[PDB]
Write a protein that binds this ligand. Structure first.
Ligand code: K
Length: 182
Protein backbone atom coordinates (compact mmCIF):
# COMPACT_ATOMS: atom_id res chain seq x y z
CA UNK A 1 0.00 0.00 0.00
CA UNK A 2 1.18 3.46 -0.87
CA UNK A 3 0.35 6.78 0.82
CA UNK A 4 3.07 9.15 -0.47
CA UNK A 5 3.69 12.31 1.57
CA UNK A 6 6.41 14.37 -0.14
CA UNK A 7 7.92 17.04 2.15
CA UNK A 8 5.95 20.32 2.15
CA UNK A 9 8.12 23.00 0.38
CA UNK A 10 5.62 25.77 -0.22
CA UNK A 11 6.72 28.08 2.62
CA UNK A 12 10.39 26.99 2.59
CA UNK A 13 12.69 29.87 1.59
CA UNK A 14 16.03 29.30 -0.11
CA UNK A 15 18.70 31.73 1.11
CA UNK A 16 19.72 34.37 -1.42
CA UNK A 17 23.31 33.15 -1.59
CA UNK A 18 22.21 29.92 -3.29
CA UNK A 19 20.78 31.75 -6.26
CA UNK A 20 24.13 31.58 -8.05
CA UNK A 21 24.37 27.75 -7.53
CA UNK A 22 20.78 27.39 -8.75
CA UNK A 23 21.52 29.11 -12.06
CA UNK A 24 24.81 27.26 -12.59
CA UNK A 25 23.22 23.91 -11.94
CA UNK A 26 20.21 24.87 -14.10
CA UNK A 27 22.62 25.78 -16.89
CA UNK A 28 24.40 22.45 -16.35
CA UNK A 29 21.20 20.39 -16.59
CA UNK A 30 20.18 22.24 -19.78
CA UNK A 31 23.68 21.67 -21.36
CA UNK A 32 23.57 17.99 -20.49
CA UNK A 33 20.14 17.63 -22.18
CA UNK A 34 21.29 19.67 -25.18
CA UNK A 35 24.50 17.63 -25.47
CA UNK A 36 22.48 14.39 -25.56
CA UNK A 37 20.08 15.93 -28.21
CA UNK A 38 22.93 17.16 -30.42
CA UNK A 39 24.65 13.70 -30.29
CA UNK A 40 21.43 12.35 -31.80
CA UNK A 41 21.60 15.02 -34.49
CA UNK A 42 18.87 17.37 -33.16
CA UNK A 43 19.37 21.04 -34.07
CA UNK A 44 17.83 24.39 -33.23
CA UNK A 45 14.48 24.99 -34.93
CA UNK A 46 11.70 27.48 -34.20
CA UNK A 47 9.25 24.64 -33.41
CA UNK A 48 9.56 21.23 -31.69
CA UNK A 49 9.43 18.68 -34.53
CA UNK A 50 10.11 14.98 -33.90
CA UNK A 51 10.43 14.15 -37.62
CA UNK A 52 12.97 16.94 -38.31
CA UNK A 53 14.58 16.64 -34.80
CA UNK A 54 14.40 20.39 -34.14
CA UNK A 55 13.91 22.00 -30.75
CA UNK A 56 13.80 25.77 -29.94
CA UNK A 57 15.59 25.13 -26.65
CA UNK A 58 18.67 23.92 -28.52
CA UNK A 59 20.58 27.11 -27.85
CA UNK A 60 22.58 28.61 -24.92
CA UNK A 61 20.88 28.79 -21.53
CA UNK A 62 22.20 32.35 -21.37
CA UNK A 63 19.89 33.30 -24.26
CA UNK A 64 16.69 32.15 -22.48
CA UNK A 65 13.93 34.33 -21.03
CA UNK A 66 13.34 33.99 -17.24
CA UNK A 67 10.33 31.74 -18.00
CA UNK A 68 12.54 29.31 -19.97
CA UNK A 69 15.35 29.32 -17.38
CA UNK A 70 12.67 28.52 -14.81
CA UNK A 71 12.00 25.23 -16.63
CA UNK A 72 15.40 24.12 -15.32
CA UNK A 73 15.55 26.18 -12.06
CA UNK A 74 12.09 25.04 -10.63
CA UNK A 75 13.00 21.37 -10.02
CA UNK A 76 16.37 22.35 -8.52
CA UNK A 77 14.60 24.79 -6.19
CA UNK A 78 12.22 22.01 -5.16
CA UNK A 79 15.18 19.69 -4.31
CA UNK A 80 16.92 22.41 -2.25
CA UNK A 81 13.71 23.29 -0.41
CA UNK A 82 13.30 19.62 0.64
CA UNK A 83 16.89 19.60 1.98
CA UNK A 84 16.23 22.90 3.90
CA UNK A 85 12.91 21.50 5.16
CA UNK A 86 14.84 18.49 6.61
CA UNK A 87 17.25 20.97 8.34
CA UNK A 88 20.29 19.94 6.35
CA UNK A 89 23.02 22.58 6.13
CA UNK A 90 24.39 23.70 2.78
CA UNK A 91 27.56 25.82 3.12
CA UNK A 92 30.23 26.96 0.61
CA UNK A 93 33.22 25.45 2.46
CA UNK A 94 35.73 25.51 -0.41
CA UNK A 95 36.49 27.11 -3.74
CA UNK A 96 34.81 25.16 -6.66
CA UNK A 97 36.85 22.78 -8.94
CA UNK A 98 25.72 25.89 -30.63
CA UNK A 99 28.13 23.38 -29.12
CA UNK A 100 27.45 22.44 -25.44
CA UNK A 101 30.25 20.64 -23.64
CA UNK A 102 28.97 20.24 -20.04
CA UNK A 103 31.35 19.11 -17.27
CA UNK A 104 31.64 15.37 -16.71
CA UNK A 105 30.39 14.27 -13.24
CA UNK A 106 31.61 10.69 -13.67
CA UNK A 107 34.67 11.26 -11.53
CA UNK A 108 32.87 12.82 -8.58
CA UNK A 109 32.77 10.43 -5.61
CA UNK A 110 30.20 10.98 -2.88
CA UNK A 111 30.93 9.88 0.68
CA UNK A 112 28.79 7.06 2.08
CA UNK A 113 26.98 9.72 4.12
CA UNK A 114 26.15 11.82 1.03
CA UNK A 115 25.03 8.65 -0.79
CA UNK A 116 22.72 8.03 2.23
CA UNK A 117 21.37 11.58 1.92
CA UNK A 118 20.79 10.90 -1.82
CA UNK A 119 18.43 8.03 -0.69
CA UNK A 120 16.22 10.44 1.24
CA UNK A 121 16.14 12.82 -1.73
CA UNK A 122 15.32 9.93 -4.13
CA UNK A 123 12.54 8.69 -1.90
CA UNK A 124 11.12 12.21 -1.82
CA UNK A 125 11.22 12.45 -5.66
CA UNK A 126 9.36 9.10 -5.75
CA UNK A 127 6.75 10.38 -3.25
CA UNK A 128 6.29 13.59 -5.22
CA UNK A 129 5.78 11.57 -8.45
CA UNK A 130 3.46 9.08 -6.67
CA UNK A 131 1.28 11.81 -5.09
CA UNK A 132 0.95 13.68 -8.39
CA UNK A 133 0.30 10.37 -10.16
CA UNK A 134 -2.56 9.46 -7.83
CA UNK A 135 -4.12 12.84 -8.54
CA UNK A 136 -3.66 12.39 -12.27
CA UNK A 137 -5.28 8.93 -12.21
CA UNK A 138 -8.30 10.17 -10.21
CA UNK A 139 -8.69 13.17 -12.54
CA UNK A 140 -8.83 10.75 -15.52
CA UNK A 141 -11.34 8.23 -14.15
CA UNK A 142 -9.32 6.07 -11.77
CA UNK A 143 -6.96 3.21 -12.37
CA UNK A 144 -3.58 2.12 -11.12
CA UNK A 145 0.16 2.19 -11.76
CA UNK A 146 2.64 -0.57 -10.89
CA UNK A 147 5.14 1.95 -9.39
CA UNK A 148 2.61 3.25 -6.80
CA UNK A 149 4.46 1.40 -4.01
CA UNK A 150 6.85 2.65 -1.27
CA UNK A 151 10.27 3.61 -2.59
CA UNK A 152 11.96 0.93 -0.41
CA UNK A 153 9.96 -1.85 -2.07
CA UNK A 154 11.12 -0.71 -5.56
CA UNK A 155 13.74 -2.78 -7.41
CA UNK A 156 17.24 -1.41 -7.94
CA UNK A 157 16.25 -0.86 -11.56
CA UNK A 158 13.10 1.09 -10.51
CA UNK A 159 15.10 3.26 -8.04
CA UNK A 160 17.81 4.25 -10.56
CA UNK A 161 16.24 7.37 -12.06
CA UNK A 162 15.50 8.93 -8.62
CA UNK A 163 19.00 7.97 -7.36
CA UNK A 164 20.60 9.48 -10.41
CA UNK A 165 18.78 12.80 -9.98
CA UNK A 166 19.69 12.96 -6.23
CA UNK A 167 23.35 12.03 -6.96
CA UNK A 168 23.66 14.65 -9.76
CA UNK A 169 22.57 17.43 -7.38
CA UNK A 170 24.86 16.36 -4.55
CA UNK A 171 27.79 15.87 -6.99
CA UNK A 172 27.34 19.36 -8.49
CA UNK A 173 27.14 20.89 -5.01
CA UNK A 174 30.35 19.10 -4.04
CA UNK A 175 32.06 20.18 -7.25
CA UNK A 176 31.14 23.80 -6.53
CA UNK A 177 32.70 23.46 -2.99
CA UNK A 178 29.50 23.08 -0.93
CA UNK A 179 29.47 20.90 2.14
CA UNK A 180 26.05 19.29 2.76
CA UNK A 181 25.53 17.94 6.32
CA UNK A 182 22.59 17.09 8.53
K1 K B 1 24.17 26.23 -22.21
Amino acid sequence: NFDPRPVETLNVIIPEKLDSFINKFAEYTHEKWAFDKIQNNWSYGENVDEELKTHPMLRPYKTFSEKDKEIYRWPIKESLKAMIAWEWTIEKAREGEYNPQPPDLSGVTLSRELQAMAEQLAENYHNTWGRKKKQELEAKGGGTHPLLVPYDTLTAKEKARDREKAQELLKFLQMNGYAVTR
